[PDB]
Design an enzyme around this catalytic site. Structure first.
Site, short mmCIF file in Angstrom:
data_model
loop_
_atom_site.label_atom_id
_atom_site.label_comp_id
_atom_site.label_asym_id
_atom_site.label_seq_id
_atom_site.Cartn_x
_atom_site.Cartn_y
_atom_site.Cartn_z
N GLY C 97 0.79 -1.22 0.00
CA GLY C 97 0.00 0.00 0.00
C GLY C 97 0.82 1.27 0.00
N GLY C 99 2.65 2.51 -2.46
CA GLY C 99 2.51 3.17 -3.74
C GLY C 99 3.72 3.01 -4.64
N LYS C 100 4.30 1.81 -4.67
CA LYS C 100 5.48 1.57 -5.50
C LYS C 100 5.10 1.51 -6.97
CE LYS C 100 6.35 -1.59 -1.78
NZ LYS C 100 4.97 -2.16 -1.85
N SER C 101 4.02 0.79 -7.29
CA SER C 101 3.62 0.66 -8.69
C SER C 101 3.16 2.00 -9.25
CB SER C 101 2.51 -0.38 -8.82
OG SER C 101 2.92 -1.63 -8.29
N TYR C 102 2.55 2.84 -8.42
CA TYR C 102 2.20 4.19 -8.86
C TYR C 102 3.44 4.98 -9.24
CZ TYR C 102 -0.86 8.26 -9.16
OH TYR C 102 -1.60 9.33 -9.61
N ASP C 245 10.49 -3.21 -9.68
CA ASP C 245 9.30 -3.00 -8.86
C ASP C 245 9.20 -4.19 -7.90
OD1 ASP C 245 5.70 -3.19 -9.52
OD2 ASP C 245 6.78 -2.59 -7.72
N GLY C 248 5.86 -5.42 -1.58
CA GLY C 248 6.11 -4.96 -0.23
C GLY C 248 5.84 -6.02 0.83
#
Ligand SMILES: CC(=O)O[C@H]1C(=O)[C@@]2(C)[C@H]([C@H](OC(=O)c3ccccc3)[C@]3(O)C[C@H](OC(=O)[C@H](O)[C@@H](NC(=O)c4ccccc4)c4ccccc4)C(C)=C1C3(C)C)[C@]1(OC(C)=O)CO[C@@H]1C[C@@H]2O
Ligand SMILES: Nc1nc2c(ncn2[C@@H]2O[C@H](COP(=O)(O)OP(=O)(O)OP(=O)(O)O)[C@@H](O)[C@H]2O)c(=O)[nH]1
Ligand SMILES: Nc1ncnc2c1ncn2[C@@H]1O[C@H](COP(=O)(O)OP(=O)(O)NP(=O)(O)O)[C@@H](O)[C@H]1O
Ligand SMILES: Nc1nc2c(ncn2[C@@H]2O[C@H](COP(=O)(O)OP(=O)(O)O)[C@@H](O)[C@H]2O)c(=O)[nH]1
Ligand SMILES: [Mg+2]
Ligand SMILES: [Mg+2]
Lengths: 451, 432, 386, 38
Positions: C97, C99-102, C245, C248
């Protein structure tokens, strides 16, 4: 089924085959007429071992053998001998003249018109075979048939079957003793085929066996029968590991895997340790250590070459009889501490070991004593180069003046086929001189980074 | 209720498995034909670990036999305990590897692996709750190393959760029996370090030393060595089959022994080993077993524990005894030999006690150490490996069957990294 | 040089807004302050990072870090280094949650896109932009994932098998039989990107409706060639852009996983624990020999304990220039994970690298010897000996 | 009229150039260091 086809070419091959098949028939209880009373007496079993004999419906056993020669004399002696009923009536004998000590006559002119029949019979034998292991070719350098026809046969077999192993037992010419004036020409010309096509070539010498049969078996006037019997014992020791049970069992592929560091150096020596007479069989313990030590003695080598002048690259010990692994380990450990036996620095292990329960047999009327233990040692070493070098010198002394050359060119060869072969021979020698050298000092010159 | 599926590969693995099944069938009172003739009711209570039940009230071991030479299978069948095995599990071919790792792994074993895996699936699907596998094989040989590594890889691909044990006979320091032992050993260890949970290192020279110095046998054969290894193998998994005051599953040993994933090479040992001659002199007590287990002479791996430190050790006792004495003796061994145990794993001695001892012994014990001294073994192999790979001593036999120098180089690199990882705990005084 | 460190804060999520939503992150210049929500009397422990991105307030313009600001700070410079000749790595980090992919992938339909769309795009519009008669460029794209200690190819067609991992003696670890394709225009690489994102394994969870179930590596092999028989060298430069990527960390209590989801979470946590251990060991090792004396006795680093750290051996140290982008959640409930992420970012700041990148070592030796000849001849001439 | 030919060796241009440049560097370095200018 671990099955092998034995091919015998020339007089030496046929006579060694006579000795070998006498030994095999004695080993498996097969009578000279092919019947085995042991199975009838007991009821059944595997005594009709498929390594060397094929069993028909009636109970007869036929050898998996192919005999070839250009004279009819040597094989006619077998067709009307004691074992006349053992062999299939085919014997692939050209009813014509012989190769006449001429390589070209046996490879080009008269070697043809008989190779096709030999290959057809070999194919017929191979079709009946399941899980074929390899071939055992017996011949002799210096002869006409045994050189040229063996070369042609090996070339055609390599073309046809390809992947199957091809072990070769051959009689290298002696340094001083000889029975022909043109031995060097044929022996040098056979280098091409004995190098490229064969997988492992065992060399034996008549002078060495004469010396053995005069110091060990105390015989003063030996004949070829004793030599053939000793060679038969060597071959039986080699092949016992796929006929009888044992603690450590060595197949034919393991031999090549362990004794052949590179493809071009497959010329190991062979030796038999407990060569002793019945009278001297007493007063001797004949333990594993004694026979293992005797295998390394220079006097007991089967080729006139001193191992101390070279370096051992690989060894393969095949034990027979009441032998326990602990004694073998102790003997190998003792051998490794001796300073006279030098191993190449790039082969730290340098030993293959195989143990078989079946003790060696005693041929009636033979010369070897009955023993409880035996060992056959094969040794791939660099001393063999010496045994070649002498021959090369002899060849030069006859090729400078082109003596005896017109006989060879008159049968279909050319002059160049001599020189090329000699050049090839030189390359082989240099290869040995390249492999026995110690690795250069700190082979990465010198090293050591910061920390 | 837990099962163990058993796999055997090669000559050494086949013979050790045969002796192991003879030792287990005695402990459980199974007769050389499958019929039960025991006396204690506890023998049948947990017989499902090793044996399936047949329709005729017979018991069949859950074993799988693999080789590429029919001679070993023929020897196993023509034996005292040959008929006990079911014939469908005899999987084999022809034209054995001939001490060629490439033939065992890439060329020939690739055909027989499907059949072996089919039999493995058939045996595994019938268990109520499978625990893990165990494999006996020799690293220095041909079909053993190659097929064992291939089967280990395939099973770990198919059964990732289950336990994978291995009782491997490694090449000896100075004793040798094949020329190309380092190549096969290096490649097999490269395969094992990734795809196993435990690996009990066994050395022929250590077993010979035990036979000669401890048991005082004059002419030891392979049967004795198989006997020892088989007593160790039974002793490992005792707690799955009999009750005890403090049990120890296989997973308990795996958790309590290995601190990090890549260090799972265990030195085994057994006690009490006397001499058939001094049995009447040595009293049997827990202190005597503790004294014999930790003795450097009694290890089966031919690596001196005094040259390193014990990351972890596990002691599994069998017989009626007091927990107070056992715990006191373990604490005593730690305290006196304070220099041979790491300082950052406080109280690194796993203890297990089982009530039922072996057949005719009042007490017994087995020892499983995990010491840095094992690095020595790898170093030896690595040294010899270099001595042949630098000149390409026998490399054409291996490259002819579909390999290349890169595989050898990466296997050597993995070995050296493993040795460095063991070394980096070996020294005392972690500060500077 | 050293690892570059960027930290970025995301806005609230529906679950966070539903429960207590008190923020704990403050960020100014190049400093990040965290306040413990359970101990308000404690000191506001702060951390220093090379880059700091407050993306909490979307519609504002007061210290708001859009996607393009993050790119112009990190990815621009990384490409420039890639052109210079270095292998470059950018890897994301954080908890589930965060926000790595964002930050990396972004939303395709919107103008706000993550790092990789910006770079693959800028580089094309620079190659195409600078192409010339002598200059020429080549690009190859690969995209792999690590699901459960197994490597899978994303751009390849349907092939359920797992690829093997080899170790080239000079180039280090790599993947065998990876479907490396060639692209000539932006449309092709966009199609590859869409196919790879569709192929990735994605599952829903309580902490994220579209959580990632596998690590992912996007690799661009980039080659610059010069064509002139008199002066230039062909295949003069080769370089690698690696964009990672990571999945988490997870906690089963809040995650609510069962069965396969729990196994995936356990494997992810195992790999991340190995990554943390190698990061800490690297940090300590480089710091000690730098500060302590200079001994360089020996320091084992557990690269082999996991496939993720094995494949990224050259990026975490040695021959690469590497950047770490940590994502942080603002809420008070995730304080214990956010502090851990900050601590590991601080540790990663201490890591060093050693990157040179040279091609065709025979040509390296030849040019070095030519330069030595020129230098020695000039020295002799200046001193009257030439 | 057999006469001596010796072996004709086709050298790699890369190794030839490397050896020539190494010899040139060695000569120049020896000249410089012998005079104490390095
Ligand atoms: C005085 C007496 O009773 O005789 C003992 C004996 O003298 C000793 C020496 C035995 C004996 O063992 C040996 O001599 C031996 C030799 C080579 C290799 C292995 C053993 C014994 O053979 C071994 C045998 O042990 C067993 O029966 C165990 O149950 C053992 N199983 C087997 O040996 C076995 C072998 C084949 C078939 C079935 C069972 C065992 C141990 C641990 C776990 C499971 C099983 C025993 C008590 C003895 C003799 C008979 C002399 C010892 O062995 C064991 C493991 O008990 C050797 O050191 C111990 C200590 C014993 O005192
Ligand atoms: N050990 C051993 N060597 C033999 C025997 N018979 C012949 N030889 C060797 O064979 C050599 C002579 O050449 P052969 O092999 O007989 O030639 P060939 O097979 O008869 O073929 P041709 O020359 O055409 O007659 C001699 O130098 C012997 O050393 C034998 O029975 N035992
Ligand atoms: N800065 C941001 N602004 C707006 N929405 C965001 C931002 N960061 C993340 N999100 C959204 O919040 C959710 C979480 O983002 P996402 O990048 O998928 O997390 P994640 O890295 O995938 N967590 P993980 O499961 O470990 O991979 C998604 O729905 C994103 O669209
Ligand atoms: N412990 C033990 N080792 C053995 C036994 N038989 C053979 N070996 C070892 O196995 C090695 C040879 O490997 P091998 O068994 O032929 O491998 P395989 O051909 O693949 O089965 C030798 O180094 C021996 O020490 C045995 O009964 N017990
Ligand atoms: Mg004749
Ligand atoms: Mg994600």
């Amino acid at each position: 089924m671990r099955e092998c086809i034995s091919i015998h070419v020339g007089q030496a091959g046929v006579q060694i085959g006579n000795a070998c098949w006498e030994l095999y028939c004695l080993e498996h209880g097969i009578q000279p007429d092919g019947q085995m009373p042991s199975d009838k007496t007991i009821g059944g079993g595997d005594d009709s071992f498929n390594t060397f004999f094929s069993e028909t419906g009636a109970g007869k056993h036929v050898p998996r053998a192919v005999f070839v020669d250009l004279e009819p004399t040597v094989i006619d002696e077998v067709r009307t001998g004691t074992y006349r009923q053992l062999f299939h009536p085919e014997q692939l004998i050209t009813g014509k003249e012989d190769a006449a000590n001429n390589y070209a006559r046996g490879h080009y002119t008269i070697g043809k018109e008989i190779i096709d029949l030999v290959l057809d019979r070999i194919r017929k034998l191979a079709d009946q075979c399941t899980g074929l292991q390899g071939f055992l070719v017996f011949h002799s350098f210096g002869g006409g048939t045994g050189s040229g026809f063996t070369s042609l046969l090996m070339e055609r077999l390599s073309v046809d079957y390809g992947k199957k192993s091809k072990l070769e037992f051959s009689i290298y010419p002696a340094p001083q003793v000889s029975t022909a004036v043109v031995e060097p020409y044929n022996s040098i010309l056979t280098t091409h085929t004995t190098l490229e096509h064969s997988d492992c070539a065992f060399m034996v010498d008549n002078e060495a066996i004469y010396d053995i049969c005069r110091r060990n078996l105390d015989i003063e006037r030996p004949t070829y029968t004793n030599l053939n019997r000793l060679i038969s014992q060597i071959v039986s020791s080699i092949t016992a590991s796929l006929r009888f049970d044992g603690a450590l069992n060595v197949d034919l592929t393991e031999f090549q895997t362990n004794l052949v560091p590179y493809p071009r150096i497959h010329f190991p020596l062979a030796t038999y340790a407990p060569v002793i007479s019945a009278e001297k069989a007493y007063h001797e313990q004949l333990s594993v250590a004694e026979i293992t030590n005797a295998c390394f003695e220079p006097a007991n080598q089967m080729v006139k070459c001193d191992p101390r002048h070279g370096k051992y690259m690989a060894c393969c010990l095949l034990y027979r009889g009441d032998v326990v692994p602990k004694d073998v380990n102790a003997a190998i450990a003792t051998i490794k501490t001796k300073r006279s036996i030098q191993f190449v620095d790039w082969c730290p292990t340098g030993f293959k070991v195989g143990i078989n329960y079946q003790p060696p047999t005693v041929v009636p009327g033979g010369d070897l004593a009955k023993v409880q233990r035996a060992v056959c040692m094969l040794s791939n070493t660099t001393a063999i180069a010496e045994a070649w070098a002498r021959l090369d010198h002899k060849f030069d002394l006859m090729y400078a003046k082109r003596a005896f050359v017109h006989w060879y060119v008159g049968e279909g060869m050319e002059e160049g086929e001599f020189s090329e072969a000699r050049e090839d021979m030189a390359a082989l020698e240099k290869d040995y001189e390249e492999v026995g050298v110690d690795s250069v000092e700190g082979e990465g010159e010198e090293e050591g980074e910061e920390y | 209720m837990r099962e163990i599926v058993h796999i055997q590969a090669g000559q050494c693995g086949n013979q050790i498995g045969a002796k192991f099944w003879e030792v287990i069938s005695d402990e459980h009172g199974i007769d050389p034909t499958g019929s039960y003739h025991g006396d204690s009711d506890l023998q049948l209570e947990r017989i499902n670990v090793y044996y399936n039940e047949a329709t005729g009230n017979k018991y069949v071991p859950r074993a799988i036999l693999v080789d590429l030479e029919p001679g070993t299978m023929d020897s196993v069948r023509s034996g005292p305990f040959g008929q006990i095995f079911r014939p469908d599990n005899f999987v084999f071919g022809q034209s054995g590897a001939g001490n060629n790792w490439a033939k065992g792994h890439y060329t020939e074993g690739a055909e027989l692996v499907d059949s072996v895996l089919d039999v493995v699936r058939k045996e595994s699907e019938s268990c109520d709750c499978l625990q893990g596998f165990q494999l006996t094989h020799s690293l220095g040989g041909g079909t053993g190393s190659g097929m064992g590594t291939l089967l280990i890889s395939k099973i770990r691909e198919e059964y990732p959760d289950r336990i994978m044990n291995t009782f491997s006979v490694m090449p000896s320091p100075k004793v040798s029996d094949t020329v190309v032992e380092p190549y096969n050993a290096t490649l097999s260890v490269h395969q094992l370090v990734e795809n196993t949970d435990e690996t009990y290192c066994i050395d022929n020279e250590a077993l010979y030393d035990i036979c000669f110095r401890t048991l005082k046998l004059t002419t030891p054969t392979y049967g004795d060595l198989n006997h020892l290894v088989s007593a160790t193998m039974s002793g490992v998994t005792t707690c799955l089959r009999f009750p005890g005051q403090l049990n120890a599953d296989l997973r308990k040993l795996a958790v309590n022994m290995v601190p990090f994933p890549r260090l799972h090479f265990f030195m085994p040992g057994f006690a009490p080993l006397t001499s058939r001659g001094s049995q009447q002199y040595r009293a049997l007590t827990v202190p005597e077993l503790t004294q014999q287990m930790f003795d450097s002479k009694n290890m089966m791996a031919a690596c001196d524990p005094r040259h390193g430190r014990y990351l972890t050790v596990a002691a599994i006792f069998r017989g009626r005894m007091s927990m107070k004495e056992v715990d006191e003796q373990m604490l005593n061994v730690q305290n006196k030999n304070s220099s041979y145990f790491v300082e950052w794993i406080p109280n690194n001695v796993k203890t297990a006690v089982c009530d039922i001892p072996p057949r005719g012994l009042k007490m017994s014990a087995t020892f499983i150490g995990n010491s840095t001294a094992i690095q020595e073994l790898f170093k030896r192999i690595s040294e010899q490996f270099t001595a042949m790979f630098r000149r390409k001593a026998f490399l054409h036999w291996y490259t002819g069957e579909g390999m290349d120098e890169m595989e050898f180089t990466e296997a050597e690199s993995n070995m050296n990294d493993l040795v460095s990882e063991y070394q980096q705990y070996q020294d005392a005084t972690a500060d500077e | 040089a050293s690892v570059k460190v960027a930290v970025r804060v995301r806005p609230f999520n529906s679950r966070e807004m539903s429960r207590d939503s008190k923020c704990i992150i403050q960020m100014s210049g190049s400093t990040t302050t965290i306040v413990n929500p359970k101990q308000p009397k404690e000191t506001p422990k702060s951390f220093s990072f090379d880059y700091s991105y407050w993306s909490h307030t979307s519609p504002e313009d007061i210290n708001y870090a859009s996607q393009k600001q993050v790119y112009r700070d990190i990815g621009e410079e990384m490409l420039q280094h890639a052109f210079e000749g270095y292998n470059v790595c950018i890897f994301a980090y954080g908890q589930t949650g965060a926000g790595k992919s964002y930050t990396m992938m972004g939303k395709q339909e919107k103008d706000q896109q993550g790092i990789i769309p910006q770079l693959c795009e800028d580089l094309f519009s620079r190659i195409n932009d600078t192409t010339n008669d002598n200059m020429s460029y080549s690009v190859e794209v690969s995209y792999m994932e690590i699901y459960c200690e197994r490597v899978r190819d994303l751009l390849n067609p349907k092939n359920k098998g797992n690829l093997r991992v080899r170790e080239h003696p000079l180039l280090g670890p790599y993947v065998e039989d990876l479907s490396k394709l060639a692209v000539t225009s932006y449309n092709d690489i966009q199609d590859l990107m869409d196919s790879g994102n569709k192929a990735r394994t994605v599952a829903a969870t309580n902490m994220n409706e579209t959580s990632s179930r596998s690590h992912a590596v996007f690799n661009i092999i980039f080659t610059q060639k010069r064509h002139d028989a008199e002066t230039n060298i062909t295949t003069e430069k080769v370089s690698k852009i690696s964009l990672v990527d990571l999945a988490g960390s997870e906690r089963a209590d809040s995650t609510g996983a069962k069965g396969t989801r729990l196994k995936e979470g356990a494997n992810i946590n195992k790999s991340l624990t190995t990554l943390g251990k190698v990061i800490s060991a690297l940090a300590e090792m480089d710091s000690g020999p730098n500060k302590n004396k200079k001994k360089k006795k020996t320091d084992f680093i557990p690269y082999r304990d996991s496939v993720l750290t094995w494949l990224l051996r050259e990026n975490l140290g040695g021959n690469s220039r590497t950047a770490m982008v940590a994502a942080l959640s603002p809420a008070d409930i995730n304080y214990d994970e956010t502090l851990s992420t900050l601590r590991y970012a601080d540790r990663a700041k201490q890591i060093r690298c050693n990157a040179v990148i040279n091609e065709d070592p025979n040509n390296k030796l030849i040019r070095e010897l030519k330069d030595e000849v020129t230098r020695l001849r000039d020295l002799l001439y200046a001193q009257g000996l030439g």
